[PDB]
Design a protein around this ligand. Structure first.
Ligand SMILES: [Zn+2]
Lengths: 25, 25, 25, 24, 24, 24, 24, 24
């Protein structure tokens, strides 16, 4: 119920960790 | 100012990581 | 066991993604 | 159970520290 | 005013450091 | 290259934090 | 054991964040 | 500026404080 807010934040981060990684790669 | 946006997430993540670490256990 | 098993997976993904983002970025 | 109150404070201070570090 | 907020939090840590250091 | 010393430490912070979320 | 590791990890994060904030 | 001036102290203070807590 609240934990998924942790995973949302990790997903949302991984997406943009990679999204950046296309501007580099 | 790209990965600052990325970093902020990691902070916000760690915020909940710890906040959930004090309540549960 | 539900989102907990999903959380470990997610996190490890992110560790790799960051470790990568170090190497290339 | 008291240490964590330190740690959570540091994290809280870390995001504020970068939240305005972006601005520059 | 956005900065002030940082120091205040930053201070709260110190006390929790020393108050934890004095205790044990 | 300056702001990459955060991410390493932040990535290592979070990982441990989450690793320890498991342990508890 | 690890609850120390974070603090150490987390200090040298906040340290650098703040250091960089001052320098820039 | 002076708030900035002040800020340098606190943080580095906190670093040493922590450094101690780590130490002992
Ligand atoms: Zn997305």
């Amino acid at each position: 119920s609240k934990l998924l807010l942790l995973l949302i934040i990790l997903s949302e981060a991984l997406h943009l960790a990679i999204l950046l990684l296309i501007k580099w790669g």
